[PDB]
Write a protein that binds this ligand. Structure first.
Ligand SMILES: CC(=O)O[C@H]1[C@H](C)[C@H](O)[C@H](C)[C@@H](O)[C@@H]([C@H](C)OC(=O)C(C)(C)CC(=O)O)CC/C=C(/C)C(=O)Nc2cc(O)c3c4c(c(C)c(O)c3c2O)O[C@](C)(O/C=C/[C@H](O[C@H]2C[C@@H]3OCO[C@@H]3[C@@H](C)O2)[C@H]1C)C4=O
Ligand SMILES: [Zn+2]
Lengths: 73, 297, 157, 89, 211, 72, 116, 85
DNA sequence: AGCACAATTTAACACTTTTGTCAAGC
DNA sequence: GCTTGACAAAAGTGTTAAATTGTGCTATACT
């Protein structure tokens, strides 16, 4: 029984957003010469913020809450 | 698989060193000038040694072999540049073919006297040919490349300020940083929107799209009742009076006519038609005549 | 629209039948202008070929009333008629190189494969440019020159 | 922490050619932008912006991080959502 | 196909000798169905290779503005766009005198775009749009495949219809049914409007509609 | 349309543009209006690009138990 | 229970129609049309009622000029006209032509007729 | 008014009839169903064309090498094939 | 990416023809 | 019953000035 809990299955989606973000920090740091590079300028956080934005919106696990009575919710 | 076949075939051509690149570059420029020389002399009425002219025509044949040989050697360079632009809305092969188009121009504009390696100058054209292609093709609704620049530029300014402020910048700040009007960036953000598929999902989306142009069934009956009703209200008018109101509103032929046009058929001044209209319009406004037309609205 | 027809028959559509149906060739992969949101000329949705967007009105607007019907516009090339024709009119695309209909190639059984006696794995390698196929051969020249060619071949060998 | 565990296992990301110190640690939170009533009324999402606090050492912002309410629900675009639990092997 | 003799290839297939007790004769017999089919009729087998591709009318592949300002369009527009894009680039390559590797590669890409246009995914991976969803080709449209298959078992929606929840009608006769007044009113709406105009309750039909 | 302009000119109404686009109540529902929330363009508020005004109307219904309702 | 009569009752005489397919469209704020499936078409055929089945599938659903002239005849009180060609079938022919299949509807004479 | 008929001829020999503009002018060239440009048979040419020359490979070479530098290269090649003989 | 440049579209403002209108006279 | 000349507004038409759009181009080596 794995029982992926909300926070734990949230973290798994952050892994993909961070890993695919680190793939860009490898490539785009090489073309530009050194001393013009910082973790800030090269890191584009779009894949990280897109993953969490793409999770609640598109995931089957993220569900529209059903509440016509306190028990249903 | 299709892309695997292209890579297997281009991998056969052996890569060239610096000395092979310059020699082929010479043969191409020699072939071009030889081809142009032979064509210009007939225009100027000149003749050459028979044997030597033959030799020039072989320079034309050999120039093209150097051109094709130079393209086939660097076909690996095009793919290496096209691997980074995958997944952005264009198929890999299309990026490769559009890259090959840039490669073709790199060979045409290359300069062997500058002594720079060919991969240095070729990367510029090959990389620009791919990007320029995406601005012209990727979007279903095409956007000029100049607008694709500012769209991509505004996205970079938006992404830089998002990191700078800690919040997504507002239209005013995004415009102040980009030196444009605040309502201008709103219009830009409308253009950057991309369409959605009507065929996506129980029932497809297109099944819910109303037809707004098709008129209701009741009105096609009421309009014909209004048409027949106005026909009777025209009977109480004079024969020319009916003709004037018809021609004026274009009830008969569908197009309104100017006073001048209307009078021309009846042979009276355009002012006289303006006078006849005022009387028919007031006579049409008489209660006995217009009593029925109130309900139709 | 008699609502009563005896037969309904089909057949392979030749390139001429396709050119006959079409009201014009769509030349551009364009859908609609991004500002005006109106159909781009010579592309998809082009009113000059498929049909006018609005009833009895052309593109430029020099013909609006129903008085002009069955005529075309000199400036924009739009026939003035009901907008329903957009649903009834087809275009076409002239191909720079011939192309196979996937239904007769990948079908089960393969219609071209059974027609020319080409195995489906061999036929896939031709139309997708994975192999060469001999279209024609000259028998007289091969038989007459076979002597000298065998000599030069054995000499090189 | 979960984010720390994810950030620590990836930290540092070492470029093959030359070493790069990208190690991330001690992520920072800010108080929630608006209340659940404001987020549901204004159609925005209930979130607390999170920026990572970590060879240059320039602290970087990441994005609006959604938060869970006392009822155990998320407001995503003004709608109250619940994340079900998944059972795999 | 240009230099090909259907009758001469049929006579060769007409032979049932050459023992052919196994699949050797049935291969010639099974394929003869496709060879004899062209001979009987006047159709040319050249129809299998298209020199021109027809374009479906736009209203059947519409692009219309959705609710809230969004845009919507059929997949055919992108699949047609895939074809005309490569067909045009092929013209540019031919006029450029490009090597045969590039030209023949573009011809293969042109071949695959028309394949995807007619029946997408039949060979190789299908063309995928946003979210990695296979585009709907003309074959999917004709078969009625929405997710997997809806083979016209949805029929079509009809006018002058309605539904509601049912309750017991123990006092009814077998030929009777209890009909809600509102449901029967909207259902017979064109009928009541007529009789209402036959009498003087409403002057004209437009007035009876509001009544 | 030509037939509509005549009545318009006769009684004085004009071809003021326009196409009527109003948010009416859906067929088969009724109630009272409890509250309205309006988002305008004059005030600086947050809204989608180009949309000037956004107004949401909330209608409440007191539903008596009726034959056909499902009980359990 | 949440299922209530006010929400589950639907009735439609005439209403909007879809754009691509000219059939009525249910699921909007007003006047949803009921679906007549093939299973219902099978029952309608079992009874042997040819006209009732034809009315549902042509002038009640897909006849562009049919459903308007019926509403007209019903208002005037005249006989209901004979149905036309359903738009679903006309769309079917174009889908075949776009597939490079040349289809032709031939009468007893006047070889080929075009819908238009 | 509304009747006026004109015919256009394409490069491949096909003929096309376009009725239009009973009261107005007629163009000299028309994009037809064939996808090719048409030409009116009656009512002459009366339209010019700009006809800008498509930029070719010779234009890109001539704008870097002078005609003297090309002539010297051509001599280097021609003398090289003479050495083969 | 970004800029330069040419080519094409757009909007301008303008001066002229067309069209609707008033007052006076036939 | 009708026309005249004034005057205006509106509709066109030719001549210009932005803007919009399309194409070309970028040289450490880079396969
Ligand atoms: C709009 C929405 O969100 O619907 C949600 C969900 C139904 C809502 O929570 C809904 C309010 C529901 O809570 C109440 C509702 C009243 O119940 C009912 O509707 C009925 C009538 C059946 C109950 C009844 O009256 O009898 C009451 C539910 C009580 C029970 C025992 C129940 O139903 N259990 C139930 C039912 C399901 O079918 C699924 C389901 C699913 C997953 C991963 C689930 O765990 C499901 C589940 O547990 O995978 C599928 C293929 O598809 C997933 C589709 C949707 O998920 C989204 C999530 C994302 O949102 C936007 O993008 C995503 C979108 C694509 O998918 C589903 C998960 C799918 O069928
Ligand atoms: Zn026009």
């Amino acid at each position: 029984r794995r029982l992926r809990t909300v926070g734990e299955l949230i973290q798994n989606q952050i892994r993909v957003g961070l890993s695919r973000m680190e793939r860009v920090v490898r490539e785009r740091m090489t073309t530009q010469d050194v001393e013009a590079i910082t973790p800030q300028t090269l890191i584009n956080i779009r894949p990280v913020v897109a993953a969490i934005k793409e999770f609640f919106g598109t995931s089957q696990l993220s569900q529209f809450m059903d509440q016509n009575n306190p028990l249903s919710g | 698989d299709s892309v695997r076949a292209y890579l297997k075939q281009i991998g056969k051509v052996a890569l060239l060193n610096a000395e092979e690149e310059v020699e082929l570059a010479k043969r191409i420029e020699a072939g071009l000038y030889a081809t142009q020389k032979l064509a210009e002399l007939a225009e100027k009425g000149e003749k050459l040694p028979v044997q030597q002219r033959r030799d020039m025509q072989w320079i034309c044949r050999d120039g093209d072999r150097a051109k094709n040989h130079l393209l086939e050697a660097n076909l690996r360079l095009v793919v290496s540049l096209a691997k980074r632009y995958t997944g952005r809305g264009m198929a890999f092969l299309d990026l490769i073919q559009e890259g090959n188009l840039g490669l073709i121009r790199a060979v045409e504009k290359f300069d062997y006297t500058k002594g720079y390696k060919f991969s240095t100058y070729a990367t510029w054209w090959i990389r620009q040919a791919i990007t320029r292609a995406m601005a012209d093709q990727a979007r279903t609704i095409r956007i000029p490349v100049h607008m694709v620049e500012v769209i991509n530029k505004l996205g970079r300014i938006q992404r830089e300020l998002l990191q700078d402020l800690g919040r997504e910048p507002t239209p005013e700040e995004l415009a102040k940083e980009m030196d444009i009007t605040p309502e201008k960036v709103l219009e830009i953000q409308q253009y950057a929107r991309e369409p959605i598929s009507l065929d996506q999902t129980d029932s497809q989306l297109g099944d819910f799209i109303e037809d707004s142009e098709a008129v209701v069934a009741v009105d096609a009956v009421s309009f014909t009742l209004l048409q027949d009703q106005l026909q009777s209200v025209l009977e109480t008018l004079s024969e020319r009076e009916a003709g004037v109101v018809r021609l004026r509103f274009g009830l008969t032929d569908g197009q309104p006519r100017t006073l001048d046009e209307i009078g021309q058929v009846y042979g009276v001044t355009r002012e006289r038609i303006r006078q006849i209209e005022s009387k028919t319009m007031s006579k049409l406004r008489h209660p006995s005549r217009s009593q029925v037309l109130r309900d139709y609205l | 629209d008699v609502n009563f027809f005896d037969e309904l028959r089909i057949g392979l559509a030749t390139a001429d039948d396709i050119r006959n149906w079409s009201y014009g060739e769509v030349k551009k992969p364009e859908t609609i202008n991004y500002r005006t949101l109106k159909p781009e000329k010579d592309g998809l949705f082009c009113e000059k070929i498929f049909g006018p967007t609005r009833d009895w009105e052309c593109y430029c607007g020099k013909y609006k009333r129903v008085r002009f019907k069955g005529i075309i516009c000199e400036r924009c090339g739009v026939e003035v008629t009901r907008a329903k024709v957009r649903r009834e009119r087809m275009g076409h695309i002239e191909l720079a190189a011939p192309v196979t209909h996937i239904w007769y190639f990948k079908g089960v059984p393969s219609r071209l494969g059974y027609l020319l006696d080409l195995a489906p794995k061999d036929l896939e390698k031709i139309i997708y440019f994975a192999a060469y196929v001999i279209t024609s051969v000259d028998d007289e020249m091969r038989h007459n020159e076979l002597s000298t060619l065998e000599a030069e071949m054995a000499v090189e060998k | 922490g979960g984010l720390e565990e994810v950030l620590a296992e990836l930290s540092p990301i070492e470029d093959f050619s030359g070493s790069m110190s990208l190690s991330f640690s001690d992520p920072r939170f800010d108080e929630v932008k608006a209340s659940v009533d404001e987020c549901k009324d204004k159609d925005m999402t209930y979130a607390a912006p999170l920026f990572v606090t970590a060879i240059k050492s320039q602290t970087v912002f990441m994005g609006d991080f959604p938060m869970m309410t006392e009822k155990g629900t998320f407001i995503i675009n003004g709608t109250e959502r619940v994340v079900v639990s998944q059972l795999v092997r | 196909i240009e230099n090909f003799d259907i009758d001469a290839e049929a006579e060769s297939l007409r032979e049932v000798i050459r023992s052919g007790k196994g699949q050797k004769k049935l291969r010639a017999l099974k394929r003869l169905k496709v060879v004899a089919a062209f001979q009987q009729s006047g159709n040319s087998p050249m129809g299998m290779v298209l020199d021109a591709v027809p374009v479906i009318p736009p209203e059947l592949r519409p692009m219309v503005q959705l609710d809230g300002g969004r845009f919507a369009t059929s997949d055919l527009n992108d699949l047609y766009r895939r074809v005309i894009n490569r067909n045009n680039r092929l013209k540019r390559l031919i006029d450029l005198g490009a090597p045969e590797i590039i030209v023949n590669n573009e011809k293969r890409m042109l071949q695959e775009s028309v394949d995807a246009l007619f029946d997408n995914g039949r060979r190789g991976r299908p063309v995928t749009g946003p979210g990695n969803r296979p585009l709907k080709s003309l074959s999917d449209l004709l078969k009625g495949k929405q997710g997997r298959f809806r083979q016209n078992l949805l029929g079509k929606r009809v006018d002058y219809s309605g539904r509601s929840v049912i309750v017991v009608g123990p006092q009814l006769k077998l030929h009777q049914c209890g009909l809600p007044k509102l449901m029967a009113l909207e259902l017979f709406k064109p009928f009541v409007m007529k009789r209402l105009v036959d009498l003087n309750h409403a002057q004209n039909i437009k007035s009876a509609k509001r009544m | 349309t030509p037939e509509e302009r005549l009545l318009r000119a006769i009684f004085g109404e004009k071809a003021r543009e326009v196409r009527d686009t109003s948010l009416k109540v859906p067929h088969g529902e009724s109630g009272k209006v409890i509250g309205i929330r309006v988002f305008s363009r004059e005030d600086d508020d947050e809204l989608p690009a180009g949309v000037n005004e956004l107004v949401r109307v909330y209608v409440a219904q007191k539903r008596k138990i009726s034959d056909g309702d499902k009980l359990a | 229970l949440h299922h209530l009569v006010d929400d589950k009752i639907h009735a439609r005489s005439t209403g909007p129609y879809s754009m691509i397919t000219q059939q009525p469209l249910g699921g909007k704020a007003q006047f949803g049309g009921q679906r007549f499936g093939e299973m219902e078409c099978w029952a309608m055929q079992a009874y042997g009622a040819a006209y009732t089945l034809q009315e549902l599938l042509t002038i009640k659903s897909d006849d562009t000029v049919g459903r308007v002239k019926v509403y007209e005849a019903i208002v005037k009180g005249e006989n209901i006209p004979e149905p036309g060609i359903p738009e679903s079938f006309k769309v079917l022919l174009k889908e075949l032509q776009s597939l490079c299949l040349n289809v032709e509807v031939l009468s007893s004479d006047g070889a080929a007729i075009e819908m238009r | 008014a509304p009747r006026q008929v004109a015919r256009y001829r394409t490069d491949n020999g096909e003929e096309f009839d376009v009725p239009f503009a009973d009261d107005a002018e007629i163009p000299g060239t028309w994009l037809c169903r064939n996808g090719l440009e048409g030409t009116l048979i009656e009512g002459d040419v009366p339209e010019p064309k700009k006809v800008k020359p498509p930029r070719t490979h010779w234009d890109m070479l001539l704008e870097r090498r002078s005609v003297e530098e090309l002539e010297e290269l051509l001599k280097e090649r021609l003398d090289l094939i003479k050495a083969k003989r």
